RNA sequence: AAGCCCUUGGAGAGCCGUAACGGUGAGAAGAGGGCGAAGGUGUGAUGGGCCUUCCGUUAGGAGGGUUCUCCUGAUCCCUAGU
């Protein structure tokens, strides 16, 4: 899993904080999220309300923040991420 | 004026910011805004109030000015944090 995931930070573009990611999913123009345990659920909902709405495949992340940002490498946590490009990575089968 | 909210915005190997504690990807920075104390300023107030000149000196009568620039400052308030 996080060598699929790894490879995607070394190349494939990738979205960082909700609201950005929010914004754009509404559109339909993302290749797929996964969320750590560890969000809201006032959000949660509304993810699962807007991945049936263009069908955007989302894998649920058992982990928090921090460890999706300990990968993500980014010192502060990450509660979600958006994905634009899968670049090279075999991801978004899931 | 704080605080708290609204868009935009997109930042970390660091940034924002405090008297202090802290805030920051759950959107920081910066831009625009909204709700919005105390107070303050106009008006009320060509009326009185304050001092004062003089003539009248019973009875009263007639004027003058009442500005400007600054400072500290409450145990008297509201406003916030912790």
Redesign the pocket.
């Given at each position: 899993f996080e060598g699929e995931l790894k490879t995607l930070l070394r190349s494939g573009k990738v979205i960082?904080?909700?609201?950005?990611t929010l914004?754009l999913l509404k559109t339909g123009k993302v290749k797929g999220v996964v969320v750590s345990s560890?969000?809201?659920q006032d959000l949660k909902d509304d993810i699962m309300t807007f991945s049936k709405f263009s069908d955007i495949p989302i894998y649920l992340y058992k982990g928090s923040?921090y460890e999706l940002?300990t990968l993500c490498?980014?010192?502060?946590?990450?509660?979600?991420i958006g994905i634009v490009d899968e670049g090279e990575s075999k991801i978004l089968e899931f």
């Open positions: 960082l904080g909700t609201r950005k914004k560890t969000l809201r923040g940002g490498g980014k010192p502060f946590m990450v509660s979600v």
